[PDB]
Ligand binder design. Structure first.
Ligand SMILES: Nc1ncnc2c1ncn2[C@@H]1O[C@H](COP(=O)(O)O)[C@@H](O)[C@H]1O
Lengths: 79, 704, 151
């Protein structure tokens, strides 16, 4: 339950650093990212190793590692 | 710039079309092969007439008409070490691993960008070589970050200000005043009167084909996608060895060639067997996707804007064929019949073509993605007969700016509805196809046009829209009628393709916050009179129109992904394990193709329902009264009723008064609705939808 | 779901009506338009009540309701047409987890005494800031000339 540091990459090319514990829901990390980047929680989602991440599940289920990368994917319109 | 393209199999045709649309200065195309029937299933520039002719000469005029300002030229003869040196980049499609090696070695020995693109069946392969030292200017694809400043001072480590982005540390920034960049506390002047950052170029080294083939380096987003790519590469090498040894490509679905291909490679034996069996034709969606990717790589090898791709890219879509618990196509079924579909029939069969000939589909929006979807539909054969057809609906006219993104639009075709001209072009692709244009927006004001009879024939909807409100409305209509939905979205270089299948996937969840921003009223007091906080002071006069110029590579990719989804959507019932949503960022070489989520269930006091479910209650012979309706609800289900309303008007309330309730309880539902709303009931409407809430939620379908 | 929550909240509001609201009424045809009559306590606004509308958006949770007045009130926070600015209902402050009761109580606070911070009517703001006596003397006359019959 010790804190672990991970990397979250956004759509602008940057990769910020977050400190999270592998016992909380993905919704909490989504709220953290929303606060740090100033976008709504319903306007994007997260991806790691291809498959997306479900909001209600703990981060320990997916099996993250220290200094891992988690991508943001916006919900885009137009066409 | 000048680009050489060798091999117009259809992948080369897609690449050339993308380059001409983007605006490549000069394009020299080289193909001596004569056009046969088995080449029309993916090439959209040829025809039945242009048969027994060289592909290059046949397609030259069609490519030239697209832009008329790029001067497309055709080369006849052979490629020697004399014409290679005159072109900035050479693209090669469907070679024989001998011309590949020769041209690759010659290009590396002379320093010219070399691309190899191949599409065998459903699998695609791409390879790039930009040379031993390539420099790229701006690997960001986004505007450089900016910040505001107030005042500064002097200090040995330096002092910086920040008035309210993150600039990290040690990078390079600019503004002392209008001078060279200084690394950063800012790295003799004590005074005080915005700040912008700059990016560094990146250097990348590539190897020649002969060296790269020995040990590949594939682009994969995870670790389970690397062994799969290695198996695909081994299968491609085995196929090339088989072609060189026997002198002929393996026969379609032939079980005797698959054994030789498998034994030659020896690893995923099942995977190589399956790709060997299905490696007989070229399909429009896979060709369109790989052509979009290759065109983007070529374009980024000229402007030197985004980061070059790595050594290899492998695209695998082996879920469009019938599942394991089904019947595989047979060699007799997958036999050439002299019709313009032999490319698809070589892998699927005539039964699939018969199935696809009858379906009727609806297409919302004849625009950027719409034209590509129409082209893919025309080349595959959705309809093209008397038992099927296609419908196209759009509301906008044609403006001058549409010409730069005009796949099917012409300069003389301005001032007339887009749906008509798009239908005319789709008919030109093959006269067998029948397309009906409708110039009426699909919004909650023309619902009488699109009634129950209108959706009684439609077997599926493809949406290509530039809004969130319209997309949510279309999804709501589709889930009301229980129909498959195919949605796509592009912005700049980002693209997404999604499929929504009733009762097996999740319903389209629109972002409510985003849809609220559009069509926002005038801000009365946020910033109108006193304040001026950010750069958005433009609202005072009345990002102004939210204009996003899409590039032709993303639209082709999303259209190809949608077609790949359709291939198994029209293939009967599927176990939801054979469906995919796709997200792509071309500039960063990002591509994910994942399995969607099962629908989420909700439980109330005793009610377990999904987003697809609904409540169905009939009526009596003359009619049934409201009290009878509530009694039947409370009898069949445990649900009581607190509020029951129809749209913006309410018919019942949990507590009003004994008198107010007894006034309304003995009345007919239709009579009550006519009493509240003076407008007459719709004669064409058959089912009335009601919204109800229990004491303390799927709609109520009142079958009139 | 903008027609369900409005009627689900009107019942709760009528269950425990606030002391400053009277004749809280709907139309029963469109459930997205309300009506009320409020009598402010602070003088010279204690004489007559004022009518208003609580018009709702087609997506109420993700948009602010319009609270345009209907009477001819003279106040340095409302326009001559009837519109009124509230910081609670704004693009930078609106939230989907706020009820209409808080909006109306903030409205009551605003109408109790002008905030003289972001006045929409610039003419009356200066008169209030400089000479409150004349503004108070004229507001009562304006209310008498145009106002409700009784609370
Ligand atoms: N709900 C809708 N019904 C019909 N056409 C639509 C709808 N929403 C968007 N469109 C059209 O779809 C096209 C999208 O533009 P573009 O993204 O440039 O292809 C435009 O022609 C729009 O008018």
């Amino acid at each position: 339950d010790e804190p672990l540091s991970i990397l979250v990459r956004n759509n602008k090319g940057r990769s910020s650093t977050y400190e999270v514990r592998l016992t909380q829901t993905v919704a909490h990390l989504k709220q953290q990212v929303s606060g740090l980047e100033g976008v709504q929680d319903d306007l994007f989602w997260l991806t790691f190793e291809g498959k997306p991440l479900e909001d209600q599940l703990p981060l320990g289920e997916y099996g993250l590692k220290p200094l891992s990368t988690v991508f943001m994917n916006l919900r885009l319109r137009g066409g | 710039a000048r680009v050489l393209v060798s091999g117009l199999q259809g992948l080369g045709a897609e690449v050339a079309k993308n380059l001409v649309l983007m605006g490549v200065g000069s394009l020299t195309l080289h193909d001596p092969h004569p056009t046969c029937w088995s080449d029309l299933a993916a090439q959209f520039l040829l025809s039945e007439q242009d048969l027994e002719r060289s592909r290059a000469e046949a397609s030259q005029e069609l490519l030239a008409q697209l832009n008329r300002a790029v001067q497309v030229v055709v080369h006849t003869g052979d490629i020697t070490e004399d014409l290679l040196l005159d072109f900035q980049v050479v693209v090669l499609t469907a070679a024989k691993l001998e011309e590949q090696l020769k041209v690759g070695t010659l290009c590396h020995k002379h320093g010219v960008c070399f691309l190899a693109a191949d599409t065998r069946g459903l699998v695609g392969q791409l390879f790039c070589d930009f040379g031993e030292d390539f420099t790229v200017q701006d690997p960001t694809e986004a505007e450089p970050l900016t910040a505001a400043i107030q005042h500064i001072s002097q200090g040995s480590p330096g002092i910086l200000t920040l008035r309210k982005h993150y600039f990290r540390d040690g990078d390079l920034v600019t503004f002392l005043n209008d001078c060279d960049p200084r690394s950063i506390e800012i790295g003799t002047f004590s005074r005080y009167l915005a700040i912008t950052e700059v990016k560094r170029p990146k250097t990348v080294r590539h190897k020649s084909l002969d060296t790269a083939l020995l040990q590949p380096h594939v682009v994969a987003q995870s670790s389970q996608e690397v062994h799969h790519a290695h198996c695909l590469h081994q299968a491609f090498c085995a196929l090339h060895k088989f072609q060189h040894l026997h002198g002929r490509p393996p026969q379609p679905w032939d079980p005797v060639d698959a054994e030789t291909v498998v034994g030659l490679a020896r690893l995923d034996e099942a995977l190589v067997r399956t790709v060997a069996l299905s490696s007989a034709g070229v399909l429009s969606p896979m060709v369109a996707m790989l052509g979009a990717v290759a065109a983007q790589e070529v374009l980024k090898a000229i402007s030197r804007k985004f980061m070059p791709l790595d050594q290899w890219l492998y695209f695998d879509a082996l879920d469009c064929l019938p599942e394991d618990g089904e019947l595989l196509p047979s060699p007799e079924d997958c036999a050439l019949r002299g019709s313009r579909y032999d490319g698809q029939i070589a892998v699927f069969g005539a039964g699939f073509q018969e199935k696809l000939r009858r379906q009727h589909y609806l297409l919302v929006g004849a625009g950027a993605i719409g034209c590509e979807l129409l082209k893919v539909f025309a080349l595959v054969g959705l309809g093209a007969g008397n038992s099927g057809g296609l419908t196209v609906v759009d509301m906008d006219h044609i403006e001058r700016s549409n010409l730069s993104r005009q796949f099917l639009f012409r300069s003389q075709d301005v001032g007339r509805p887009k749906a008509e001209v798009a239908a005319a072009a789709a008919r030109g692709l093959n006269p067998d196809l029948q397309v009906i244009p409708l110039t009426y927006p699909l919004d909650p004001t023309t619902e009488h046009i699109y009634g129950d009879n209108f959706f009684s024939r439609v077997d599926g909807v493809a949406a290509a829209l530039d809004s969130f409100q319209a997309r949510r409305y279309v999804a709501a209509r589709c889930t009301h009628y229980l129909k498959p939905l195919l949605e796509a979205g592009t912005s700049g270089t980002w693209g997404s393709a999604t499929v929504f299948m009733p009762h097996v996937t999740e319903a389209y969840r629109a972002p409510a916050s985003a849809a609220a921003s559009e069509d926002a009223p005038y801000p009365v007091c946020t910033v109108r009179y006193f304040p001026s906080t950010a750069e958005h002071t433009l609202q005072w006069a009345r990002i102004v129109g939210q204009i996003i110029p899409a590039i032709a590579t993303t639209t082709a990719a999303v259209a190809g992904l949608l077609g790949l989804e359709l291939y198994k959507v029209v293939s009967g019932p599927r176990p939801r394990s054979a469906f995919r949503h796709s997200y792509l960022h071309l500039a960063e070489n990002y591509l994910i193709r994942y399995m969607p989520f099962a629908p989420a269930i909700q439980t109330f006091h005793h009610l377990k329902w999904t987003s697809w479910d609904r409540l169905k209650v009939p009526a009596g012979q003359p009619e049934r009264t409201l009290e009878s309706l509530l009694a039947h609800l409370q009898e069949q289900h445990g649900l009581r009723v607190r509020i029951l309303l129809h749209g913006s008007a309410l018919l019942y309330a949990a507590g009003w008064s004994p008198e107010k309730q007894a006034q309304h309880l003995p009345l007919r539902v239709t009579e009550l609705v006519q009493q509240l709303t003076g407008q007459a009931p719709a004669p064409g409407q058959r089912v009335l939808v009601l919204e109800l809430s229990c004491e303390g939620f799927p709609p109520l379908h009142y079958e009139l | 779901m903008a027609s369900m929550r409005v009627v689900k909240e009107l019942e709760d509001l009528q269950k425990k009506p606030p002391p400053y609201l009277r004749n809280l009424s709907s139309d029963d045809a469109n459930v997205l338009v309300w009506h009320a009559l409020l009598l402010p306590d602070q003088p010279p606004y204690h004489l007559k009540a004022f009518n208003l509308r609580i018009s709702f958006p087609p997506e109420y949770p993700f948009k602010p309701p319009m609270i345009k007045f209907t009477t001819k009130i003279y106040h340095p926070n409302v326009d001559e047409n009837g519109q009124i600015c509230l910081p609670i209902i704004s693009s930078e402050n609106w939230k989907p987890s706020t009820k209409t009761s808080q909006v109306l109580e903030a409205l009551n606070v605003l109408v109790n005494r002008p905030n003289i911070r972001e006045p929409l009517r610039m003419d009356l703001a200066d008169l209030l800031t400089q000479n409150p006596e004349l503004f108070r003397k004229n507001a009562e006359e304006f209310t008498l000339r145009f106002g409700v019959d009784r609370p």
